Design an enzyme around this catalytic site. Structure first.
Site, PDB file in Angstrom:
ATOM      1  N   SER B   1      87.723  54.856  71.904  1.00  0.00           N
ATOM      2  CA  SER B   1      88.390  53.645  71.351  1.00  0.00           C
ATOM      3  C   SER B   1      88.669  53.787  69.858  1.00  0.00           C
ATOM      4  O   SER B   1      87.851  54.337  69.114  1.00  0.00           O
ATOM      5  CB  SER B   1      87.527  52.417  71.621  1.00  0.00           C
ATOM      6  OG  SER B   1      86.154  52.695  71.440  1.00  0.00           O
ATOM      7  N   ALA B  69      83.208  52.000  70.267  1.00  0.00           N
ATOM      8  CA  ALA B  69      81.852  52.469  70.563  1.00  0.00           C
ATOM      9  C   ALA B  69      81.368  53.297  69.384  1.00  0.00           C
ATOM     10  O   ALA B  69      82.113  54.117  68.870  1.00  0.00           O
ATOM     11  CB  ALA B  69      81.828  53.282  71.840  1.00  0.00           C
ATOM     12  N   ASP B  73      72.738  57.712  67.787  1.00  0.00           N
ATOM     13  CA  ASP B  73      71.636  58.078  68.667  1.00  0.00           C
ATOM     14  C   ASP B  73      70.600  56.973  68.634  1.00  0.00           C
ATOM     15  O   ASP B  73      69.732  56.945  67.754  1.00  0.00           O
ATOM     16  CB  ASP B  73      70.990  59.394  68.241  1.00  0.00           C
ATOM     17  CG  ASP B  73      69.933  59.881  69.232  1.00  0.00           C
ATOM     18  OD1 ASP B  73      69.574  59.127  70.168  1.00  0.00           O
ATOM     19  OD2 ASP B  73      69.398  61.015  69.147  1.00  0.00           O
ATOM     20  N   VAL B  75      68.873  56.311  71.539  1.00  0.00           N
ATOM     21  CA  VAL B  75      68.100  56.556  72.759  1.00  0.00           C
ATOM     22  C   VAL B  75      67.346  57.878  72.739  1.00  0.00           C
ATOM     23  O   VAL B  75      67.942  58.941  72.584  1.00  0.00           O
ATOM     24  CB  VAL B  75      69.004  56.583  73.987  1.00  0.00           C
ATOM     25  CG1 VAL B  75      68.180  56.776  75.241  1.00  0.00           C
ATOM     26  CG2 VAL B  75      69.838  55.292  74.069  1.00  0.00           C
ATOM     27  N   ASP B  76      66.034  57.802  72.915  1.00  0.00           N
ATOM     28  CA  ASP B  76      65.197  58.973  72.975  1.00  0.00           C
ATOM     29  C   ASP B  76      64.449  58.995  74.322  1.00  0.00           C
ATOM     30  O   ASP B  76      64.253  57.968  74.965  1.00  0.00           O
ATOM     31  CB  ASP B  76      64.197  58.979  71.814  1.00  0.00           C
ATOM     32  CG  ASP B  76      64.858  59.096  70.469  1.00  0.00           C
ATOM     33  OD1 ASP B  76      66.013  59.636  70.393  1.00  0.00           O
ATOM     34  OD2 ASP B  76      64.275  58.657  69.433  1.00  0.00           O
ATOM     35  N   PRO B 205      65.664  64.209  67.159  1.00  0.00           N
ATOM     36  CA  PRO B 205      66.215  63.188  68.053  1.00  0.00           C
ATOM     37  C   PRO B 205      67.141  63.758  69.141  1.00  0.00           C
ATOM     38  O   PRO B 205      67.658  63.032  69.968  1.00  0.00           O
ATOM     39  CB  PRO B 205      66.984  62.294  67.089  1.00  0.00           C
ATOM     40  CG  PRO B 205      67.434  63.245  66.053  1.00  0.00           C
ATOM     41  CD  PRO B 205      66.238  64.096  65.811  1.00  0.00           C
ATOM     42  N   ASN B 241      85.842  56.815  67.232  1.00  0.00           N
ATOM     43  CA  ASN B 241      84.549  57.289  67.717  1.00  0.00           C
ATOM     44  C   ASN B 241      84.090  58.512  66.914  1.00  0.00           C
ATOM     45  O   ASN B 241      83.329  59.348  67.409  1.00  0.00           O
ATOM     46  CB  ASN B 241      84.602  57.622  69.199  1.00  0.00           C
ATOM     47  CG  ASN B 241      85.087  56.463  70.045  1.00  0.00           C
ATOM     48  OD1 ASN B 241      85.925  56.646  70.920  1.00  0.00           O
ATOM     49  ND2 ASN B 241      84.569  55.269  69.789  1.00  0.00           N
ATOM     50  N   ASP B 252      72.939  62.130  70.907  1.00  0.00           N
ATOM     51  CA  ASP B 252      72.365  63.410  71.323  1.00  0.00           C
ATOM     52  C   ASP B 252      73.073  64.085  72.492  1.00  0.00           C
ATOM     53  O   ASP B 252      72.708  65.204  72.842  1.00  0.00           O
ATOM     54  CB  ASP B 252      70.849  63.300  71.587  1.00  0.00           C
ATOM     55  CG  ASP B 252      70.502  62.401  72.738  1.00  0.00           C
ATOM     56  OD1 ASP B 252      71.140  62.505  73.795  1.00  0.00           O
ATOM     57  OD2 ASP B 252      69.570  61.579  72.682  1.00  0.00           O
TER      58      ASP B 252
HETATM   59  O1  LIG Z   1      84.472  51.369  76.019  1.00  0.00           O
HETATM   60  C1  LIG Z   1      84.716  51.585  74.844  1.00  0.00           C
HETATM   61  O2  LIG Z   1      84.225  52.666  74.237  1.00  0.00           O
HETATM   62  C2  LIG Z   1      85.535  50.588  74.070  1.00  0.00           C
HETATM   63  C3  LIG Z   1      84.685  49.431  73.603  1.00  0.00           C
HETATM   64  C4  LIG Z   1      83.811  49.565  72.532  1.00  0.00           C
HETATM   65  C5  LIG Z   1      83.052  48.476  72.123  1.00  0.00           C
HETATM   66  C6  LIG Z   1      83.169  47.259  72.781  1.00  0.00           C
HETATM   67  C7  LIG Z   1      84.047  47.126  73.849  1.00  0.00           C
HETATM   68  C8  LIG Z   1      84.803  48.215  74.260  1.00  0.00           C
HETATM   69 CA   LIG Z   2      67.909  60.941  71.190  1.00  0.00          CA
END
Ligand SMILES: O=C(O)Cc1ccccc1
Ligand SMILES: [Ca+2]
Lengths: 206, 557
Positions: B1, B69, B73, B75-76, B205, B241, B252
């Site tokens: 996105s 998005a 990171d 999440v571990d 991480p 992104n 990660d």
């Molecule tokens: O799916 C995705 O990466 C796009 C998106 C990012 C954050 C909130 C809604 C949609």
């Molecule tokens: Ca991690």
């Protein structure tokens, strides 16, 4: 009046809700959502709670098991129970609004039941705040912010250390899966700021 | 996105412009839901995925907001110590702690029901994979327990009237998401929001940590640590992104990298190209980025250096010359089936061959597979999501950069061979493969274009519509599933703000029992295809003047 909910749709069908308090506002929101995307939301609900097999059968058992294994419902419920009255009104209003429409739908299905329900062989049921919360939780969180491959990562590193030796292996891992790369284009320019944290990249946890 | 926010210093005929394109694939009915809320402290318009209470893409006449998005990171994985003698337990801080467990039953249509148990520890739910009698992995999310807060923060943020009020909400959103701000005064802002763990010194991480206790997170980092900028000197905020900030570490995922090669440069380029941009120009960037081959710019110089000393008659030479004349902007031929230029096909074949020769050759099986994709792979229905530079490609880029790359080349991906030679060998494979398929006259090569499909199944692969409801679009476009633009203080309007969006196929997914599709079932599909857009109304007067229908409910809680 305090109990009035006005719904005005524009030339593309987009709804604008007008309401006095919170519960009424999101009641309107849920109402129009039930009107526009009921099947979509029902299937999204099943996607996020892992109850797709119940209507689509055996090919979705694994999908269902995977969903339920990736979250803890009780934890979501407890979060809802702790919500203040105002915040609750949001999820409660949204649910109720959907229910108002769903009730009209199951009262006059011959004209209101989205065709897909007939096609897939079932009818829509009532929603609770949990359900509404889970649409967001199950998509945005359990799916879009839940990424990790650390186990695979360690497998790779191990394979690299066996192939190139311990020191060179670690170094190659930092070549294919670098922690950071200073040449990476950033949304925030270096003149503005940088991230203060420095992280271990030797897998010292072992 | 993607998303680009143009501030006062770079906005033409306006003070601020926000263009957002979330990319989650394409679906029917639409991925997002158009909604306007007015009352209870709210006054907003926009659209949002799965009709979340809070609008992820919208404005309130004073400020506007968007997301992409974050891919930080958060999440571990904790390697828990189990005991065959103590089923249901795990060792944590010297004591065998009882795991959490629950019974689930999968009801199955026309099938036998299935009951199983889900296990959880202080670190998170136990993974199904990689289990032994002595080990189990628990997936730990820094946002665990903050799901609702994030939902609410995404809602309350709609009430913000300035940077401070807004960041206050951003500080409560715990998922790894990029939030963006813009306002009537031409201010713009960015926050890489989310809960991020305060890891123990020595914690890498990218790899699992023992769950016995000594490696537990100290807690969560403060909001101060979250990357953010308000009114940057650059005059704009662009993201696809890519990395939020220098030294900020990425997810990660082995297949995810933030390096020299990044698609966001495609956006930076267009925004820096012009001192100021109007709304139409900012909107145009969608069209351009959606058709931009993402690998040409990365590897062309290498392709040029390698072929600079060849004779005109060398086919490898002419392939590169073909690329040199190309802007990398794919366009469909009149047949609505093929691309006017064969550049992506050339790049694809070559890149695939380079990766196989380099990165793939240096990585032991079966991990080698992770680096073989060229990033052009697709099916007949077209990409299920956005197109990106592949991980293998990004690694390869660092290698062709030589010393210019800040990543030590612990191993030579070219194994002692001159890079030119490997590049030439790949060009030879390219010409062989393509010339044998399309003939020896490049000028009449009509290579397949990617198409786009609005799938009937949601991103989970679960049907959200009948199969027949699938829609098709000849031209694939690397753009947002939806696109919305907010322009603050437009000079040609009598409104302090203008906004537009496109929700394809349409606002409604309703089909009556007799199969009569709703009037708003597909009235935005062609608009999406031609990079069109429709107005989002906010004021009572605008909504009223554009009213199609009305309804008033009277209900008591
Ligand atoms: O799916 C995705 O990466 C796009 C998106 C990012 C954050 C909130 C809604 C949609
Ligand atoms: Ca991690």
């Amino acid at each position: 009046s305090s109990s009035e909910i006005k719904i005005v749709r524009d030339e593309y069908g987009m709804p604008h809700i007008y309401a006095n308090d919170t519960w009424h506002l999101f009641y309107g929101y849920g109402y129009v959502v039930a009107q526009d995307r009921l099947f979509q939301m029902e299937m999204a609900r099943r996607s996020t709670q892992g109850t797709v097999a119940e209507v689509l059968g055996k090919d979705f058992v694994k999908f269902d098991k995977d969903i339920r294994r990736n979250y803890w419902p009780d934890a979501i419920r407890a979060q809802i129970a702790a919500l203040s009255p105002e915040d609750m009104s949001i999820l409660q209003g949204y649910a109720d609004g959907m229910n108002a429409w769903i009730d009209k739908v199951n009262t006059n299905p011959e004209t209101l039941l989205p065709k897909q329900f007939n096609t897939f062989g079932f009818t829509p049921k009532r929603w609770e705040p949990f359900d509404v919360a889970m649409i967001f939780v199950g998509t945005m969180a359990n799916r879009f912010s839940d990424s990790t491959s650390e186990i695979d990562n360690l497998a790779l590193l191990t394979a690299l250390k066996d192939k190139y030796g311990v020191s060179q292996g670690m170094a190659v891992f930092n070549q294919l899966k670098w922690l950071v790369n200073p040449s990476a284009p950033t949304t925030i320019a270096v003149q503005e700021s940088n991230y203060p944290l420095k992280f271990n990249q030797q897998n010292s946890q072992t | 996105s993607n998303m680009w926010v143009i501030g006062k210093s770079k906005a033409q005929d306006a003070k601020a412009i926000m263009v957002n394109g979330p990319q989650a694939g394409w679906y029917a009915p639409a991925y997002t839901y158009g909604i306007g809320l007015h009352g209870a402290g709210y006054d907003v318009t926009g659209n949002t995925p799965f009709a979340y209470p809070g609008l992820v893409f919208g404005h309130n006449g004073v400020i506007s907001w968007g997301s992409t998005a974050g891919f930080g990171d958060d999440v571990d994985i904790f390697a828990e110590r189990l005991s065959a003698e103590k089923p249901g337990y795990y060792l944590h801080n010297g004591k065998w702690v009882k795991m959490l467990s629950r019974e689930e039953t999968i009801t199955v249509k026309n099938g036998q029901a299935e009951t199983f148990t889900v296990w959880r520890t202080v670190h998170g739910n136990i993974l199904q994979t990689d289990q032994t009698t002595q080990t189990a992995y628990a997936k730990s999310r820094a946002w665990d327990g903050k799901e609702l807060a994030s939902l609410l923060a995404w809602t309350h943020q709609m009430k913000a009237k300035n940077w401070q009020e807004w960041t206050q909400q951003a500080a409560k959103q715990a998922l790894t998401i990029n939030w963006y701000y813009a306002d009537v005064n031409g201010n713009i802002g960015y926050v890489h929001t989310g809960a991020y763990p305060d890891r123990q010194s020595g914690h890498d991480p990218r790899l699992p940590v023992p769950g016995t206790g000594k490696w537990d997170w100290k807690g969560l980092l403060p909001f101060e640590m979250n990357p953010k900028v308000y009114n940057p000197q650059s005059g704009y905020i662009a993201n696809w992104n890519n990395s939020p900030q220098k030294d900020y570490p990425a997810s990660d995922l082995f297949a995810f990298l933030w390096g020299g090669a990044d698609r966001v440069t495609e956006i930076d380029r267009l925004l820096e190209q012009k001192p100021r941009l109007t709304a139409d120009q900012a909107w145009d960037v969608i069209r351009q980025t959606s058709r931009q081959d993402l690998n040409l710019r990365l590897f062309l110089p290498t392709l040029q250096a390698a072929t600079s000393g060849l004779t005109q008659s060398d086919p490898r030479r002419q392939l590169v010359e073909t690329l040199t004349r190309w802007d990398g902007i794919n366009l469909l031929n009149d047949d609505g089936k093929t691309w006017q230029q064969p550049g992506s096909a050339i790049l694809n074949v070559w890149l695939t061959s380079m990766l196989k020769r380099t990165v793939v050759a240096a990585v032991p099986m079966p991990f080698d597979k992770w680096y073989s994709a060229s990033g052009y792979e697709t099916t007949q229905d077209g990409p299920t999501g956005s197109l990106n530079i592949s991980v293998g490609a990004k690694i390869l880029y660092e290698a062709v950069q030589g010393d210019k790359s800040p990543i030590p080349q612990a191993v030579d991906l070219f194994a002692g061979k001159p890079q030119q030679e490997v590049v030439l060998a790949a060009l030879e494979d390219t010409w062989e493969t393509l010339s044998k398929r399309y003939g020896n006259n490049v000028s009449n090569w009509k290579t397949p274009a990617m198409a786009l499909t609005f799938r009937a199944n949601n991103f989970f692969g679960v049907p959200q519509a009948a199969a027949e409801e699938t829609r098709h679009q000849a031209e694939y476009q690397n753009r947002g599933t939806e696109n919305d633009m907010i322009v603050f203080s437009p000079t040609t309007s009598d409104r302090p703000v203008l906004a537009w969006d496109v929700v394809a196929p349409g606002q409604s997914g309703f089909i009556a029992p007799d199969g009569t599709v709703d009037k708003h079932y597909e009235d935005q599909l062609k608009m999406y295809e031609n990079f069109g857009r429709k107005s989002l109304w906010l004021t009572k007067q605008d909504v009223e003047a554009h009213k199609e229908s009305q309804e008033v409910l009277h209900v008591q809680r």
